[PDB]
Design a protein around this ligand. Sequence first.
Ligand code: 8W4
Length: 371
Amino acid sequence: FVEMVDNLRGKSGQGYYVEMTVGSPPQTLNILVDTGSSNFAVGAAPHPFLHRYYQRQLSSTYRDLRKGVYVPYTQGKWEGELGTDLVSIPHGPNVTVRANIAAITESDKFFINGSNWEGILGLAYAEIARPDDSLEPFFDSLVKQTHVPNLFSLQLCGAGASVGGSMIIGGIDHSLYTGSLWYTPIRREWYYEVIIVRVEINGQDLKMDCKEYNYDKSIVDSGTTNLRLPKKVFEAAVKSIKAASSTEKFPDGFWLGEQLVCWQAGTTPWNIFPVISLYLMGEVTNQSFRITILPQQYLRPVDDCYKFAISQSSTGTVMGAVIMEGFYVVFDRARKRIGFAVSACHVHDEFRTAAVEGPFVTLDMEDCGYN
Ligand SMILES: CCc1cn2c3c(cc(C(=O)N[C@@H](Cc4ccccc4)[C@H](O)[C@@H]4NCCN(Cc5ccccc5)C4=O)cc13)N(C)S(=O)(=O)C(C)(C)C2
């Protein structure tokens, strides 16, 4: 697994990517790692924001599937042509797989100027694959065709400009975290869906029906930047965060994610922004654990200037990259569970720590799920 340590790079707010090759001879591309979708897709035609793209002409192993495809994301969309080809991950397990690939021929607000990735690796399950669930996702192909175990782990690290991390394919690398792993069930195999059973801000319970926390659903999504919260929860949370930080004032466009807020270098008043604890359903009866998030996670750095990285959703909670940052996150597909621990690259505050703590007792956790 040491071969996979530090195999991710990215720019802040523009995702994390891993190097892969496609085709014979191998064509090299940077691919964003997305646990929030299920298609493997690459630029396959010129685009202003692509430094390179997949050239199907030049691969002896390419096979056309004679079928088109499109995927609408929350941010941007693309369309293209389905095919298969041979795929490797150079800083990955030592294997070559024949996988479905969507060649992107048109797109809208998908590729990001200067991001340095040319494609996307949807690691979630077939149920949300386009055009439908008969298009086997990449990780399913990988597992079926090799002896790679059915799990991967993600260590997303913040700054320390440019970001990095590790994607361990096939297991858990114990040098990437400290303390104990805490596991929450995958509620259903489509998104990496989970259930949040309690929320506290600076130790104060939001005191909402826990169904609200999962209104629609809650997912763990490395392809989304922000922590995204259903309307009612978002409003409760911002209220509590404003009140905690009310010795300063911010344009409420800051609270909407539109405007930066800046302080003289090294003077950011971290102490006035609360910690946020999300309690997740545990593995045994009436048992949960919490992950605690620092303001250094949800004030994304862009003097020292930041964007508010908590925003509103209408498709459920999205535990995005800024939540995953500093945690070591195990996507244990084999045992239908998501593990969290404190990362080796965890986020540092001089008087506060990000934590994964348990056990907690929580009654009636099944009521927190939404139908
Ligand atoms: C990193 C750029 C980025 C910046 N922001 C957002 C952003 C979101 C998403 C987002 O969308 N990510 C997609 C994949 C993707 C990744 C890179 C570029 C395009 C797309 C993911 O897959 C998502 N996972 C849940 C289900 N769905 C819908 C779906 C797809 C396929 C099958 C079923 C369902 C997603 O699209 C990306 C960004 N923000 C809104 S936000 O964080 O708050 C923001 C601060 C306003 C800005």
